[PDB]
Amino acid sequence: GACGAIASTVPNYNNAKLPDPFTFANGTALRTKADWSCRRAEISALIQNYEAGTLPPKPPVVTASFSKSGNTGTLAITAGLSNSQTIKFSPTISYPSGTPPANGWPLIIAYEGGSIPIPAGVATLTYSNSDMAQQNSASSRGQGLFYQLYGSTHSASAMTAWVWGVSRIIDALEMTPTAQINTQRIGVTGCARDGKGALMAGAFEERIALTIPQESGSGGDACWRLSKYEIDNGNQVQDAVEIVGENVWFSTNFNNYVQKLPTVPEDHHLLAAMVAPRAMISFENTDYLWLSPMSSFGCMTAAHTVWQGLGIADSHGFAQVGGHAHCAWPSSLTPQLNAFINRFLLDQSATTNVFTTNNQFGKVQWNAANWITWTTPTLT
Numbered sequence: 001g002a003c004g005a006i007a008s009t010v011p012n013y014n015n016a017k018l019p020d021p022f023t024f025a026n027g028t029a030l031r032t033k034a035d036w037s038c039r040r041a042e043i044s045a046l047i048q049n050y051e052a053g054t055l056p057p058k059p060p061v062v063t064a065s066f067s068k069s070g071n072t073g074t075l076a077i078t079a080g081l082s083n084s085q086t087i088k089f090s091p092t093i094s095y096p097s098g099t100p101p102a103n104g105w106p107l108i109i110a111y112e113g114g115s116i117p118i119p120a121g122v123a124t125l126t127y128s129n130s131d132m133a134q135q136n137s138a139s140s141r142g143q144g145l146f147y148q149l150y151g152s153t154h155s156a157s158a159m160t161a162w163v164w165g166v167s168r169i170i171d172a173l174e175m176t177p178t179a180q181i182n183t184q185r186i187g188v189t190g191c192a193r194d195g196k197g198a199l200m201a202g203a204f205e206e207r208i209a210l211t212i213p214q215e216s217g218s219g220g221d222a223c224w225r226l227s228k229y230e231i232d233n234g235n236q237v238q239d240a241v242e243i244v245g246e247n248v249w250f251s252t253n254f255n256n257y258v259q260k261l262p263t264v265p266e267d268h269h270l271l272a273a274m275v276a277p278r279a280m281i282s283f284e285n286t287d288y289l290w291l292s293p294m295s296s297f298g299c300m301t302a303a304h305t306v307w308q309g310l311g312i313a314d315s316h317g318f319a320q321v322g323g324h325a326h327c328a329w330p331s332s333l334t335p336q337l338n339a340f341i342n343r344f345l346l347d348q349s350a351t352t353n354v355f356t357t358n359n360q361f362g363k364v365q366w367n368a369a370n371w372i373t374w375t376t377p378t379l380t
């Protein structure tokens with residue numbers, strides 16, 4: 001390829017601070033905006049290798065039929081491999097009433113319906129991601145429609161299986177004009193465990209124009225290294241060690257690294273940066289130390305440097321507040337959410353400069369010089 005041989009491992013890696021977005025595994029420095037495409041491809045391979053498992057490509061069979069009852073469409077999808085194995089699933093779409101825009105409705109793919117308010121001119125697709133890969137506990141490993149296609153021992157984590165499903169949904173929408181969706185204006189959202197999922201979807205599926213993870217916490221927009229710092233200093237956060245025993249959001253291989261995080265040549269600031277140069281705003285809640293609040297702020301601050309280096313800082317937002325229940329939406333943040341939806345899904349001239357925290361981090365502080373070691377280059 002134009003990126004040469006993509007690295008999927010870095011055996012000698014050992015860095016207690018955040019991995020540098022702007023240096024390839026081979027030591028080459030990023031210099032151009034085009035370099036970011038290759039670096040993102042390498043980050044994708046590293047994340048798959050160390051924590052996410054293998055993301056399969058589009059299978060040889062993908063078919064879709066559509067029917068509509070009232071304002072509810074049903075998109076019946078079939079996916080199949082060359083060995084004849086197939087699975088089927090049928091997300092529903094809730095439409096705004098009346099005549100759609102020329103190019104169809106903008107759409108947000110909402111994991112299990114999401115927990116954000118979706119404005120009136122945007123359609124909502126409800127993605128039953130738990131059916132694609134189960135997520136009750138460690139007991140759920142290898143269970144779900146995805147594994148009925150690829151096998152229950154396939155390395156994909158549940159979140160990687162969910163991403164695969166989103167990619168098939170977008171495949172189906174592109175081949176189904178009667179769904180009346182503008183496939184150039186698709187967003188994705190989810191809250192809590194499904195916010196972890198939504199971030200993975202936006203990172204790995206480049207056809208998503210806007211990514212909105214809501215209270216995703218550890219394994220979402222928090223960084224593993226920063227959460228280890230938090231837990232060592234007395235905040236009762238979720239961390240890498242606990243999360244792999246709690247559920248199946250990560251590959252089994254990640255168990256080999258959760259006690260050796262400095263040897264992992266990525267962290268979730270690079271996961272989030274895989275969305276660049278597309279748009280993302282994530283929302284966090286400081287009321288629950290489980291979500292690892294300092295870790296999310298520092299992690300997204302580090303991710304933000306990639307957008308800054310690409311000259312598109314305002315395509316990446318972060319808003320972190322307290323004072324509300326988990327996955328309840330505070331009206332105080334509706335303007336920030338709507339700014340990103342209006343700009344990136346509704347083609348309005350909305351400004352999207354949102355990068356705010358209350359710094360309510362408990363027993364630690366954020367010290368950027370202790371975690372971010374790189375200067376930000378102006379990619380050309």
Ligand SMILES: *[C@@H]1O[C@H](CO)[C@@H](O)[C@H](O)[C@H]1NC(C)=O
Nearest residue numbers: 003004005006024026028038
């Ligand atoms: C370093 O790796 C990147 C990513 O594969 C590649 O684009 C670049 O050309 C490599 N450097 C050299 C000197 O081959």
